[PDB]
Amino acid sequence: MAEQRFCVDYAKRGTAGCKKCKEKIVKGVCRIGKVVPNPFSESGGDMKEWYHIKCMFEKLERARATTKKIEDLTELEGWEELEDNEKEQITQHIADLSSKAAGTPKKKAVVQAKLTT
Numbered sequence: 861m862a863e864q865r866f867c868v869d870y871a872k873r874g875t876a877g878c879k880k881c882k883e884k885i886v887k888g889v890c891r892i893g894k895v896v897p898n899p900f901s902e903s904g905g906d907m908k909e910w911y912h913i914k915c916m917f918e919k920l921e922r923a924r925a926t927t928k929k930i931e932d933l934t935e936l937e938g939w940e941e942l943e944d945n946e947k948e949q950i951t952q953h954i955a956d957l958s959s960k961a962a963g964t965p966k967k968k969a970v971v972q973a974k975l976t977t
């Protein structure tokens with residue numbers, strides 16, 4: 861019994877504490893909604909939560925490899941509403957989280973840049 865539903869939506873109004881981090885989702889942040897059935901209450905059948913772009917993608921890097929979630933940039937209900945510019949930012953996360961395509965094997969890479977305008 862493995863049923864998992866994921867959706868893509870953008871923040872519209874109000875702030876919500878994202879899961880897996882000490883932050884909140886405010887207008888201007890894109891979040892994915894995961895609808896899973898919880899075997900505990902009868903009224904609360906399936907619940908959905910919003911995540912950040914690094915929190916949801918960071919969980920995949922730590923989650924087990926045998927199971928994969930969210931493949932490519934066209935396997936979720938919501939990316940169509942997003943815009944081409946915003947879609948490019950989401951594709952970069954999967955390319956950095958997956959990497960290794962032809963000749964670029966890299967592991968554990970972090971950079972700290974500070975620019976002011």
Ligand SMILES: [Zn+2]
Pocket residue numbers: 878879880881882883884911912915
């Ligand atoms: Zn977060």
